[PDB]
Design a protein around this ligand. Structure first.
Ligand SMILES: COC(=O)CN(C)C(=O)c1ccsc1
Lengths: 237, 300
């Protein structure tokens, strides 16, 4: 059924699974027209499809041309997401196909179930977890490839860099969600925490800085402080 | 006018004939029902006074044979049987009619209710939903499950309604996923009407039979089927106009006949609110919307 805190360890077992987040598929800026009306202008988007055990991220870039001449774009975006996820599954060898796909938003359930009717053994599940994957576009290298795209494109990343050489998947996912939650809550402060030290850099082939184990402990504490600080600011606590 | 004679009434029972019903006491001198209108299917149904469990009954058409009811004390129910000896049957009916031991089918002249509820219902189609080929009449009861219910367990005792499943490969063309899911016209017109039912009259016949089994027996799977067949039409943007107008009539008389006190168990809020207020056909069912709003405003 639904994925929650009670069955959280399931994320890191040996059954292949993918999270799908569609929050950045259809992106717009809202502006005034010359006549004083309001209009939207779409910008490039992306599907965030993530294997939480391995860190493999299938980033399908949604180019704005896919919306041209289409109506009800917020509805269409869910079905386009489901179409692209189904196409990805079919593109994978059988032994790499997921046994479960967990959607971060319940409105994705029916579009994905319908697109996956040919795969009756792949469970489509919601989750009760509030996952911060909308903040993926706060990761500079992901945002850059999305905004530079001139056509539909799939780009593959490992969202954990090389962390699994030193930590478990459970700890890696915990770090990722903390970092993403911090970037979502206060993007400027989170980026300052991550980059303030000139001596620590991001490898060309990585998304995050090359922190030692002890430095990651400091960073994680600073991210938790940021989240708590923002909570106090928001609620006057 | 035809008759269903009864050998006797050895157990106290509420007897239904179509939309009518009456109580028979234990060992009362009751010998059957006369003046049954020729030209329609009928249903004769039963609910025992000492055990309201299992409503059950028989769909029949008097043009297809001479049928009578006799209590079986081993199986504990009133059974329908066919008499092949026509002279014997005429003699038995005349004796009962002479002794005034029969109730008269109590149809008012102005009253087209039963025709309106069974307009498209045919005995030959009932016998394909209810499979018992050795009899010309069909037994149904409160507890019989449908083929679809049995996929999600005795196959010989099932209601073989046409399976409708909005999230099935049958309902969704590859490459038309969004289109076919949000607009069920393909599934309605090509798969169901052209493909399976052949025409709208057969579709409406099954819809009407499903409603009647839900209402007279409290058969839950029949109610599911009735609502699915409504929702399939309402959720289709392209429906022939004659079908929409006929569906409005069909549903109006169904809602009109439903007992007010059974509405909580016979009507699905989601389906009805969706059909009347959100669906493609929200403005095509004028008579049904008017009776629903005046009779069951709480459901909505
Ligand atoms: C209603 O039609 C019936 O045939 C009922 N029945 C069998 C009798 O009344 C009967 C026949 C032979 S001795 C009693």
């Amino acid at each position: 059924g639904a994925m929650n805190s009670s069955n959280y360890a399931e994320l890191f077992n040996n059954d292949i699974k993918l999270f799908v987040d569609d929050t950045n598929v259809y992106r717009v800026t809202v502006h005034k027209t010359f006549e004083g009306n309001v209009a939207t202008k779409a910008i490039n988007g992306c599907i965030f499809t993530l294997n939480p055990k391995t860190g493999h991220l299938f980033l399908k870039i949604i180019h704005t041309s896919v919306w041209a001449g289409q109506k009800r774009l917020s509805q269409l975006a869910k079905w386009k997401t489901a179409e692209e996820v189904s196409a990805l599954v079919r593109s994978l060898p059988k032994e790499e196909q997921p046994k479960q796909i967990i959607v971060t938003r319940k409105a994705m359930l029916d579009p994905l179930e319908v697109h996956m009717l040919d795969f009756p053994n792949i469970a489509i599940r919601p989750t009760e977890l509030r996952l911060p994957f909308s903040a993926a576009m706060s990761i500079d290298k992901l945002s850059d490839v999305v905004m530079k795209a001139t056509e539909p494109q799939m780009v593959l990343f490992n969202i954990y860099d090389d962390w699994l050489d030193r930590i478990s998947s459970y700890t890696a996912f915990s770090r990722l969600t903390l970092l993403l939650r911090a970037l979502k809550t206060n993007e400027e402060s989170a980026k300052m925490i991550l980059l303030s030290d000139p001596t620590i850099t991001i490898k060309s082939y990585h998304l995050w800085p090359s922190f030692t184990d002890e430095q990651w402990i400091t960073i994680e504490s600073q991210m938790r402080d940021l989240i708590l600080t923002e909570y106090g600011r928001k609620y006057n606590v | 006018m035809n008759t269903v004679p009864f050998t006797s009434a050895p157990i106290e029972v509420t007897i239904g004939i179509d939309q009518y019903s009456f109580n028979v006491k234990e060992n009362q001198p009751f010998h059957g029902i006369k003046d049954i209108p020729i030209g329609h299917v009928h249903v004769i149904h039963f609910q025992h006074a000492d055990n309201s469990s299992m409503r059950y009954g028989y769909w029949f058409d008097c043009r297809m044979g001479n049928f009578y009811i006799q209590y079986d004390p081993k199986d504990g129910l009133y059974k329908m049987m066919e008499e092949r000896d026509g002279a014997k049957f005429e003699n038995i009916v005349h004796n009962f009619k002479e002794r005034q031991m029969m109730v008269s089918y109590p149809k008012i002249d102005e009253d087209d209710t039963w025709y309106n509820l069974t307009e498209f219902v045919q005995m030959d189609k009932i016998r394909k939903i209810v499979r018992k080929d050795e009899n010309q009449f069909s037994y149904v009861d409160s507890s019989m499950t449908t083929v679809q219910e049995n996929e999600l367990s005795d196959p010989a005792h099932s209601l073989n309604y046409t399976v409708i499943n909005f999230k099935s490969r049958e309902a969704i063309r590859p490459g038309h996923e969004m289109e076919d899911f949000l607009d069920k016209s393909y599934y309605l017109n090509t798969v169901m009407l052209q493909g399976i039912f052949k025409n709208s009259s057969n579709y409406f016949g099954e819809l009407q039979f499903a409603f009647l089994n839900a209402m007279f027996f409290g058969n839950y799977g029949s109610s599911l089927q009735w609502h699915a067949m409504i929702e399939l039409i309402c959720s289709s943007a392209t429906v022939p106009k004659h079908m929409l107008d006929k569906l409005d009539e069909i549903l109006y008389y169904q809602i009109k006949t439903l007992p007010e006190q059974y509405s909580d168990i016979l009507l699905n809020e989601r389906v009805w609110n969706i059909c009347l207020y959100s669906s493609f056909q929200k403005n095509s069912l004028h008579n049904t919307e008017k009776i629903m709003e005046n009779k069951y405003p709480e459901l909505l």
